[PDB]
Every structure is written in C-alpha cells, then in structure tokens.
Amino acid sequence: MKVEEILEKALELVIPDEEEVRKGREAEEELRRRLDELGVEYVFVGSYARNTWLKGSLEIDVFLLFPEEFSKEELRERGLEIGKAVLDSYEIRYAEHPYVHGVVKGVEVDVVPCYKLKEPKNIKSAVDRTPFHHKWLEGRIKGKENEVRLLKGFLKANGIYGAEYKVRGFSGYLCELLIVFYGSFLETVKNARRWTRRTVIDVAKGEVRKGEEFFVVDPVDEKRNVAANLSLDNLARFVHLCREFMEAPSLGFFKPKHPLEIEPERLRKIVEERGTAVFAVKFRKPDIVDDNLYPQLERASRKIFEFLERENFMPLRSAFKASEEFCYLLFECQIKEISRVFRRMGPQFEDERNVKKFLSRNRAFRPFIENGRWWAFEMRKFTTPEEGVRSYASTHWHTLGKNVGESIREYFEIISGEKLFKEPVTAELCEMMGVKD
C-alpha cells in the first residue's frame, strides 16, 4: 500500500507505548538520585539512553566509570557494592566478568564496573567497548531513532533480532551501525539485497568491500566483527526477506506469523505421506542459562544427525526445543528400516596375515572377494533409526555437551508416533518438515 505508508503504520508496532516511556523515565530519575547521592561517576549507555529501544524491550544500562589506577579486584568488589546499594534487588550474572543485573521500580537495570577511559585502544573486555559504542553512536543516531526501531522490529517479527545464541541474529548495536551507514531503514533493506557471505561493511571508512566472511567492522575497534554472532543462515534469511519486502511490501513483515497450531491428525497424515521416520530424544533440561544450553543442544543434535548419516538412515533435518522441564532433539530420516546384514570391508587379497585374521571370525555367511579385496557379510545391532539412537545416546552421551550429555546419561526417551504428539514439539516438527498453512 505504498512503502511510505506501510512504514508509518509499522512505527506504531515499533515505538514503545506511553506508560512504558514514563515507566523508564522514573526508573531513570530514581537511579540517578541513588548514584548521585553516593558520588559515583557513571554513564547511561545502550538503547534506552538513545531512545532507540524496541517496544517491549525496556532495559537501562549504567556503567560505573572508575579511575584508570584501580586494580582488577578493587573494581570488581567496589563496583558491585554500589550495585547492591542502588538496586531494589541485585544479582551477579556473567557476560565475561561479573556485573550487577537487577531492577529499579519495575525496570531491568545492568550495572557494570569499568575503567574511565578517554580514547579506546585502552580496553580489556567487550564491557570496556560499550561506553565507546555509545559515545560513537550518540549524535550520529539523532533524528534516526525511529529508523532503528523499524529495523529492530522487522528483525524481531521474523525471529532474527538478538545476538544471543538462542537467536544468532542481529544485535541492537549492529542495527544502529547499519542505520548510520545507510541512513534509513529502507536504504538498509534495499542495500542488504546485495549482501553476500563475504561482505565487509566498514562503517568508520564509509565503505563496503569483499573479504573472507560477513564482517561489520566496529568503528570503535577495527578487529571486532559487530556481526560475529549473526549465523550464516540468518544472514541469508535477512537478505531474502529484504528482497521479498522490496518486491511486495506489507505491514505483515513487522507482525509475527499467526502460528500453525495444527492438530495431531494433520501431522499424522503429513508424516504418512512423506513416509519418513519422525522421532525425538527427550530428557531433562539442565539448569544452565540459555547461552550455555543452546550451543549444547546444537551440538547434541548435530552429533546424533551425523551418527544417523554415518549409519545410513539418511536424516533429512533435525531441530531442538527446550521447554520448562524437558529438552527435545528432533529428527526425520528417510530410512525407517535397514537390513540386518551389511558389508564389512576386509584386506586386499595380497596381505596374507591380515586375510587370515579376517577369515578367522565366525560368521553366518561366507566372506567374498570383490575388486581385489575381501569383504564379509555381518549383522547390524539395530535396524531402525530409533534403535540406533537409543544405542548412540546410551553409549556416547559424553559427546553431547557437558550438561546435555550428563542429563541424557541419567535419563532419556526416544519418542515416535502418537506419543510424540503428546509433547510440545508439534510446532517445531511442522517447521522442520516445511508444513504449509
């Protein structure tokens, strides 16, 4: 309905509501009042400070700015003493070093100790870049705050906003960089139609060029890829979404898709038509944070996938899901049942000693020569992909992630058929099979 008018409407899906802005205003006035009362040097950073934050994602970040001659333990103790005193409630989470993540008057706050520094090239972590991120962006992003939100909003409605490992999408900083680079949401989208897996966006040089991987060069530090956590597949998806948008623009690109919620009977039909084996490994969710869990689920599900390939069950795709209590590793394979008999490779006919060993083993059928080499018929211990994985998970849990493996060691189940539809996995199965609306 004309791009200019669709963007206007999306601004209402994207700009946070009234009581949200003023909920942040008073948590920002309370927090100032507490820190000011204590004499701490501080700075508000992140997207709240710049009025670029998405509707629904209100977060205040405050960095404590402590003189360059403070030790690595003295800043770690003192910095958290102020975080106790300033927050309604406090805890010590870790991004790399400890930092207080709590609440003030109903609003998430992160308090972070870090060196007071003028000029970068004098920093230690991802934490010490942040004040410089903010400084670099403040003023350049003025007038363009709504563009950022439109971009964050576009990404979020399509499941690719957030650099955390559950998402492996676009961070807020990345979105603000992009807007500074291209000028607007719409120019970002138009230009991203030509991005490749080798595109280097060098923001500080005003330059796009080719290199080895997708890389957005941090204007604060030229060694840092701001898009380091963006996965290749989400880059691909973004590029394609940008092409689709410019081809037939629509408000629905800023709305989440009315989900599938199909009933067991359609799924039964679909599975029957496809003629695959569909099953899940179920086990108890380890009590670790997301950024630790999701890489483990990815590795577990990859390991089982490779086992199934190697064992000739021809896996099509796999997926994984964490619920409150359980995790699920989900698979679909082209082979529902393989023969009991298989070929085991023996030695070249020349190698007398080793042929003798190969021929010693008692078997039910006679070995044979083919293309100059011995081979023997031997028997598999499992004939379905479900039995295979029972066996693999029982024996090779050690390879399925530190905590994922240890949980599976304690308890796991293979689920197929009508039982698989009693678990909260239907949505994931549908997506994994490309089920249409």
Which parts are annotated binding residues?
47, 50, 59, 61, 110, 133, 152, 161
For residues 210 and 290, what is the distance between their CA atoms, to the nearest angstrom? 33
| Partner that binds at residue 61, options a second copy, Na ion, Mn ion, none, CB closer than 5 to 8 Å by kind | Mn ion
Q: Nearest 5 degrees, angle CA 85-CA 43-CA 162?
A: 95
C-alpha distances (whole Å) from 71 to each of 94, 97, 115, 343 are 19, 14, 10, 65
The correct pick among 21, 126, 232, 289 for binding a second copy (CB under 8 A) is: 232
For residues 137 and 177, what is the distance between their CA atoms, to the nearest angstrom? 8
Binding mask 200-239 for Mn ion (x = CB under 5 A): ------------------x-xx--x---------------
Among the residue ranges 93-101, 219-227, 263-271, 393-401, the one whose residues contact Na ion (CB under 5 A): 393-401
Count CB atoms within 10 A of the CB of residue 185: 26
Is 228 or 316 the residue whose CB approaches Mn ion more closely? Answer: 228
| Partner that binds at residue 395, options Na ion, Mn ion, a second copy, none, CB closer than 5 to 8 Å by kind | Na ion
- Type of residue numbered 437: D
Is 61 or 147 the residue whose CB approaches Mn ion more closely? Answer: 61
Using CB under 8 A as the binding rule, whether residue 345 contacts a second copy is answered as no
Using CB under 5 A as the binding rule, whether residue 391 contacts Na ion is answered as yes
Which residues on neighbouring strands pair with residue 317, listed in sequence order?
Answer: 332
For the bound state, the minimum distance from the C-beta of residue 205 to Mn ion, rounded and expressed in Å, comes to 16
Question: Is residue 55 classed as helix, strand or coil in its secondary structure?
Answer: coil
For residues 46 and 134, what is the distance between their CA atoms, to the nearest angstrom? 6
36's tokens? 């000011």
171's tokens? 């961070």
| Partner that binds at residue 110, options a second copy, Na ion, Mn ion, none, CB closer than 5 to 8 Å by kind | Mn ion
Among the residue ranges 29-37, 56-64, 245-253, 300-308, the one whose residues contact Mn ion (CB under 5 A): 56-64
Binding mask 295-334 for a second copy (x = CB under 8 A): -----------------x-x-xx---------------xx
For the bound state, the minimum distance from the C-beta of residue 377 to a second copy, rounded and expressed in Å, comes to 5
For residues 26 and 105, what is the distance between their CA atoms, to the nearest angstrom? 8
For the bound state, the minimum distance from the C-beta of residue 357 to Na ion, rounded and expressed in Å, comes to 25
Q: Nearest 5 degrees, angle CA 199-CA 202-CA 203?
A: 130
In this structure, what are the phi and psi dihedrals at residue 99, rounded to the nearest 5 degrees? -165, 145
For residues 291 and 326, what is the distance between their CA atoms, to the nearest angstrom? 17
Using CB under 8 A as the binding rule, whether residue 119 contacts a second copy is answered as no
Using CB under 5 A as the binding rule, whether residue 191 contacts Na ion is answered as no
Extended strands (E) in 88-247: 92-94, 98-103, 108-115, 199-202, 207-210, 215-217
Residues 6+ apart with CB under 8 A from 40: 64, 82
The correct pick among 206, 258, 261, 339 for binding a second copy (CB under 8 A) is: 339
Using CB under 5 A as the binding rule, whether residue 381 contacts Na ion is answered as no
Using CB under 8 A as the binding rule, whether residue 289 contacts a second copy is answered as no
Phi-psi region of 332 (alpha: psi -120 to 50; beta: other; left: phi over 0): beta
Enumerate binding residues for a second copy (CB under 8 A).
Answer: 193, 196-197, 232-233, 235-237, 239-240, 243, 273-276, 312, 314, 316-317, 333-343, 349-350, 352, 355, 364-372, 377, 383, 433-436
Binding site for Mn ion (CB under 5 A): 59, 61, 110, 129, 218, 220-221, 224
